Design an enzyme around this catalytic site. Structure first.
Site: not given
Ligand SMILES: O=C(CCc1cccc(NS(=O)(=O)O)c1)NCc1cccc(NS(=O)(=O)O)c1
Ligand SMILES: [Cl-]
Ligand SMILES: [Cl-]
Ligand SMILES: [Cl-]
Ligand SMILES: [Cl-]
Ligand SMILES: [Mg+2]
Length: 297
Positions: A180, A216, A219-221, A261
């Site tokens: 992650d 979420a 990020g990875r997706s 992310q």
């Molecule tokens: O809150 C979080 C983390 C969300 C999250 C929470 C848990 C895991 C993962 N990773 S994943 O599974 O690879 O997607 C991601 N990030 C902030 C966030 C949220 C939604 C949009 C943005 N916009 S951004 O332009 O800053 O990228 C930023």
């Molecule tokens: Cl992990």
């Protein structure tokens, strides 16, 4: 041009500032339905919602909400459904969405447990003999077989609409070693996996959009879909130089927030696209080399 740009960004050390520019440019659209009180328990993360305009609607009845977005890439002519890892009360919804959207493939980029916490429900059966019934959505799901590799597993699932008794084969592509907020171990291991998905036919325009999820669903997706769409675009044109990666990521971000992310996930996307371009432009042999380098056996 992406490889020239990659080198200047690396040379100047400016991945953080480049990634920040993406964040400040990204679309912001409302997510009123995701934020309704009744949907609070359908969302895994407070700050990760589908935009209303692109959200997937379930064809129930009581509540059509699932945290899932259709990323419809018009010029590439490919669509993906990006979603969060299903929660204990949304596994039936998740399979309802796969059935209604006619997806053939599900790409899972996370593990059920990551860093001591539950990042995704166990939404598919682990043993042939212990099938799953989603009573809320009237679906049954049975493990048919699996092919376990060193860092990813492919499963054949049979999904059955118990109302009609129609059955479909769903292929589940499970990448189990992508940390992650991290990157895959190499361009090779990432591309060996992406090309396994591609080879299955799951991405065919004759099927519904492939479902891609992590925890979420951003990020990875987003890193996975970004690399695939960029490869698709240079393949259609046979012209690597025509691909603007950051423009592609900003187009995708019109459909779901937060795609990609970290700045290093962006950097890795460039690496996977530059490397995959070798295959797209007709060096078929690099695919064998990715397979060796990935150590899948
Ligand atoms: O809150 C979080 C983390 C969300 C999250 C929470 C848990 C895991 C993962 N990773 S994943 O599974 O690879 O997607 C991601 N990030 C902030 C966030 C949220 C939604 C949009 C943005 N916009 S951004 O332009 O800053 O990228 C930023
Ligand atoms: Cl992990
Ligand atoms: Cl797992
Ligand atoms: Cl752990
Ligand atoms: Cl969970
Ligand atoms: Mg057994």
């Amino acid at each position: 041009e992406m490889e020239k740009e990659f080198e200047q960004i690396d040379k100047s050390g400016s991945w953080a500032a480049i990634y920040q520019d993406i964040r400040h440019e990204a679309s912001d659209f409302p997510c009123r339905v995701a934020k309704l009180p009744k949907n609070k328990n359908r969302n895994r993360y407070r700050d990760v919602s589908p935009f209303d305009h692109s959200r997937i609607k379930l064809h129930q009845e009581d509540n059509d909400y699932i945290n899932a977005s259709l990323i419809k890439m018009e010029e590439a002519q490919r669509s993906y459904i990006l979603t969060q890892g299903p929660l204990p009360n949304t596994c039936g919804h998740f399979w309802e969405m796969v059935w209604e959207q006619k997806s053939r493939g599900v790409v899972m980029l996370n593990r059920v447990m990551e860093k001591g916490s539950l990042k995704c429900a166990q939404y598919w059966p682990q043993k042939e003999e212990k099938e799953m019934i989603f009573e809320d959505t009237n679906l049954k799901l049975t493990l048919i077989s699996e092919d376990i590799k060193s860092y990813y597993t492919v499963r054949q699932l049979e999904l059955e609409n118990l109302t009609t008794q129609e059955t479909r084969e769903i292929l589940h592509f499970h990448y189990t070693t992508w940390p992650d907020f991290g990157v895959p171990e190499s361009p090779a291991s990432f591309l060996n996996f992406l090309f396994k998905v591609r080879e299955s036919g799951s991405l065919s325009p004759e099927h519904g959009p492939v479902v891609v999820h992590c925890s979420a669903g951003i990020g990875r997706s987003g890193t996975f879909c970004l690399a695939d769409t960029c490869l698709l675009l240079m393949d259609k044109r046979k012209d690597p130089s025509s691909v603007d990666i950051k423009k592609v990521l900003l187009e995708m971000r019109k459909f779901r927030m937060g795609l990609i992310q970290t700045a290093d996930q962006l950097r890795f996307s460039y690496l996977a696209v530059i490397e995959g371009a070798k295959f797209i432009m007709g060096d078929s042999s690099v695919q064998d080399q990715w397979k060796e380098l990935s150590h899948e056996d």
